[PDB]
Amino acid sequence: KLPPGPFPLPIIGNLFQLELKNIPKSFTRLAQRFGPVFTLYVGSQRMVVMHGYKAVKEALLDYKDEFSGRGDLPAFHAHRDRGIIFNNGPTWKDIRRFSLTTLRNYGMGKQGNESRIQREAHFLLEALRKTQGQPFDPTFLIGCAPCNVIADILFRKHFDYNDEKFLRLMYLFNENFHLLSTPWLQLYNNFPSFLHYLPGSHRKVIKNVAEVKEYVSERVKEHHQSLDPNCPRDLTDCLLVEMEKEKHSAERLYTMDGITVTVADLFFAGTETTSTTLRYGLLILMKYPEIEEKLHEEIDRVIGPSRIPAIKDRQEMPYMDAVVHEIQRFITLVPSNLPHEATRDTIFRGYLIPKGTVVVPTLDSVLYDNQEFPDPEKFKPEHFLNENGKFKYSDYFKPFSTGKRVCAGEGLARMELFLLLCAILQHFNLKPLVDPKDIDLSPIHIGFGCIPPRYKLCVIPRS
Ligand code: HEM
Numbered sequence: 001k002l003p004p005g006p007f008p009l010p011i012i013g014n015l016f017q018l019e020l021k022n023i024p025k026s027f028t029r030l031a032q033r034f035g036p037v038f039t040l041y042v043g044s045q046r047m048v049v050m051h052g053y054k055a056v057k058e059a060l061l062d063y064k065d066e067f068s069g070r071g072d073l074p075a076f077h078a079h080r081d082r083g084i085i086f087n088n089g090p091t092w093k094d095i096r097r098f099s100l101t102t103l104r105n106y107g108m109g110k111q112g113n114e115s116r117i118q119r120e121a122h123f124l125l126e127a128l129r130k131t132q133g134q135p136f137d138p139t140f141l142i143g144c145a146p147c148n149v150i151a152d153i154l155f156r157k158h159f160d161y162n163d164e165k166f167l168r169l170m171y172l173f174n175e176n177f178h179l180l181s182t183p184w185l186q187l188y189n190n191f192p193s194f195l196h197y198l199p200g201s202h203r204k205v206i207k208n209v210a211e212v213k214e215y216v217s218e219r220v221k222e223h224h225q226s227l228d229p230n231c232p233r234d235l236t237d238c239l240l241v242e243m244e245k246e247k248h249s250a251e252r253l254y255t256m257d258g259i260t261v262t263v264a265d266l267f268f269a270g271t272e273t274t275s276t277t278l279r280y281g282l283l284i285l286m287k288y289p290e291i292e293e294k295l296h297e298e299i300d301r302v303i304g305p306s307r308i309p310a311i312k313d314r315q316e317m318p319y320m321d322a323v324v325h326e327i328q329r330f331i332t333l334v335p336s337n338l339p340h341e342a343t344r345d346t347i348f349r350g351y352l353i354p355k356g357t358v359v360v361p362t363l364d365s366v367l368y369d370n371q372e373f374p375d376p377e378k379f380k381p382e383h384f385l386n387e388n389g390k391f392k393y394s395d396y397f398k399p400f401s402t403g404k405r406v407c408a409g410e411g412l413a414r415m416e417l418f419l420l421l422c423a424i425l426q427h428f429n430l431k432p433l434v435d436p437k438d439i440d441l442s443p444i445h446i447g448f449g450c451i452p453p454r455y456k457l458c459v460i461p462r463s
């Protein structure tokens with residue numbers, strides 16, 4: 001017996017019960033009608049949506065084994081069943097297992113990411129300085145930092161904030177996230193064979209995915225050409241090393257394609273997600289001026305004017321620590337989560353979930369619990385502060401999801417936001433170009449991710 005659901009039309013299924021512009025909003029209205037677990041047929045496909053903390057958690061942590069599958073995202077067939085993000089493949093477990101070790105290896109003990117992030121701050125602040133308190137779009141300035149840090153681990157490379165290619169990768173990272181959040185792409189996601197060869201912006205999305213693979217494609221070969229196993233420069237090498245080690249083995253768990261993808265997945269997950277979060281925060285901060293002033297006091301007090309931020313200071317900085325969370329909690333960046341598939345026929349609660357069913361654990365439903373985070377719509381740092389002004393942890397804070405497939409880099413991301421935000425304000429004040437009262441923090445698009453509005457701003461030195 002399948003989970004409860006709406007009746008489905010022939011061919012199109014349950015598409016009338018969905019607003020492509022706000023799929024998440026749609027799930028939520030459905031949750032009311034049918035509760036926490038419900039069945040939906042979108043196009044041909046069958047999916048189950050879990051809404052709410054209790055339900056979403058069970059699936060994620062209780063059927064970690066049962067639900068480790070990954071739904072199909074067509075714009076991304078070019079990466080499918082390869083790399084780590086997109087495989088419902090047998091190669092996923094190990095590639096994921098290994099990439100993590102390597103990702104972790106670089107971050108904790110090579111002095112770590114902190115060293116890496118800290119050095120980037122120097123560049124970031126410089127570029128910001130170069131603006132000289134005049135209005136600019138932060139999209140391609142701010143984002144440089146997340147991308148470079150990522151670049152080092154992956155390719156031990158370091159772009160200048162001005163080379164064309166760098167910006168292009170970025171421009172492409174932005175364009176895809178943007179497109180992936182719009183109505184046409186949502187339909188394409190579920191009616192691909194149908195729509196694929198018609199003109200659409202689905203085509204631009206696909207081209208970029210390719211340009212990005214190709215750029216990453218070459219850098220891998222470049223790595224091979226110069227590859228010294230004895231000393232491995234970066235994540236990409238370690239990947240090579242592993243491949244050669246197992247070459248005369250007949251059945252392969254690494255291919256060049258496989259590495260290029262895996263590297264790509266990390267390249268933009270690693271880049272775009274953080275840049276978007278950073279950009280949203282600056283806008284949020286500009287709306288509530290008083291929250292910024294409060295922050296500013298702690299940094300100066302705790303860290304001083306010059307000393308660069310470092311994580312030892314998080315314990316000592318309760319308002320930042322909270323602000324950093326609430327931004328993640330408030331913006332609900334990947335709301336419908338990233339899709340899961342049921343590995344084997346499974347029973348959830350009382351229901352049967354078939355193999356190949358698409359299981360959705362929806363974060364935005366978790367992060368807006370109106371019981372956990374009262375006035376969930378509102379940005380309040382005191383969501384994460386207790387009455388004594390100290391930080392308060394929440395089991396409900398899952399921007400990165402949880403379980404078997406939890407975002408691969410929950411650490412880099414978190415560390416980046418704090419140190420990076422924490423720097424920005426050490427040294428600058430943010431000035432909006434319009435009255436603060438007039439900002440709209442609502443996302444412009446909602447699909448894969450929730451996309452913030454375009455804005456320009458001025459940053460005013462503090463020296
Ligand atoms: C900006 C902060 C980020 C947020 C809020 C975020 C969010 C997420 C979410 C919700 C998932 C889905 C997990 C699931 O299906 O249950 C995911 C997966 C993933 N993330 Fe992130 N992400 C962020 C940044 C990053 C960064 C910096 C990296 C750098 C390596 C990264 C790499 C990955 C990868 C490879 C996956 C695939 C999960 C898998 O199936 O193994 N992400 N992320």
Ligand SMILES: O=C(O)CCCCCCCn1ccnc1
Pocket residue numbers: 172173174176177208209212268269270272273334338407449
């Ligand atoms: O088309 C491209 O190549 C760029 C797409 C950018 C995707 C946003 C990352 C969401 N995410 C998922 C896991 N971590 C972040």
